[PDB]
Design a protein around this ligand. Structure first.
Ligand SMILES: [Zn+2]
Ligand SMILES: [Zn+2]
Lengths: 171, 171
């Protein structure tokens, strides 16, 4: 089902989310969470979603797009469950994007993040990954790990001048 | 009548508004602006309003409250037309407030501003003033002169952690 998405202002979105145990992923309620999470992220037309965004401080991130209406330009993104992630910048080069967040509705903000990172996670399966992601993917992944350390894009806005509502930014 | 209030994202709210001429205040359309401005500020239940907030880059600020629903606590404020203002900090001491703005609907942000300033303006009459304002008044006056130099409270947010929507901040 679709869970209620917490909005910027709730202190939860700022608390640090702790790791998931190899025990949990094989748990029943966990599987029911990934279900909800996906169901919620889709109804929201978002590129991804972090557990805390719905009240759960577990290091659980979800993603997936395929022709998105909320961010027209962007490339389709393949669904994937990202757990206990750990990103690291592989360069100082940065790609700029007017990011948005389901937890900060109706607004957009230019944010410059590194464009090439090394990330290491784990899946519903228990598999260990450790690749180097680049381009839009990296952006989204970074954006969503942030939620896990209580960080929202507004905290990184290149500059408050470049931040506002949609209805007005496109005009 | 009530004019449409520009929302954060419109580049106008960031442009510098120029001064008003002793000629204008005695003008007909000017008087019609102060009318609208007031009518608009009231319908909005705001403590004040700056010309640019409705598309006019003239150094015209308006104020007035008396039992406000949008900011319950705050002291009533007496209507007044403030023109070509010029504020100056008279201290480093600062009072904190979760400010809001009609141009940035549904949100609130903790902002620390000086609590004792020297301001010099002019009225619909043409009178020259130069007093030292303190307390809530100073806050509001500073908040509204900012609009004249293209500045919104988000640009001063003490810290992004303390910024969010109303429905969620009170909870
Ligand atoms: Zn988000
Ligand atoms: Zn304002």
């Amino acid at each position: 089902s679709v869970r209620k998405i917490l909005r910027m202002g709730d202190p939860i979105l700022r608390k640090i989310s702790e790791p998931v145990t190899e025990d949990e992923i094989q748990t029943k309620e966990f599987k029911k969470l990934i279900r909800d999470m996906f169901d919620t992220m889709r109804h929201a037309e978002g590129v991804g979603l972090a557990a805390p965004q719905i009240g759960i401080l577990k290091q659980i991130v979800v993603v997936g797009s395929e022709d998105n209406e909320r961010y027209p330009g962007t490339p389709d993104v393949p669904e994937r469950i990202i757990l206990n992630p750990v990103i690291t910048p592989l360069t100082k080069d940065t790609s700029g994007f007017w990011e948005g967040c389901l937890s900060v509705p109706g607004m957009r903000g230019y944010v410059e993040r590194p464009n090439q990172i090394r990330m290491q996670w784990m899946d519903e399966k228990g598999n260990q990954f450790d690749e180097t992601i680049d381009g839009y993917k990296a952006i989204v992944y970074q954006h969503e790990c942030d939620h896990l350390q209580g960080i929202l894009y507004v905290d990184r806005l290149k500059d408050t001048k470049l931040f506002g509502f949609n209805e007005t930014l496109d005009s």
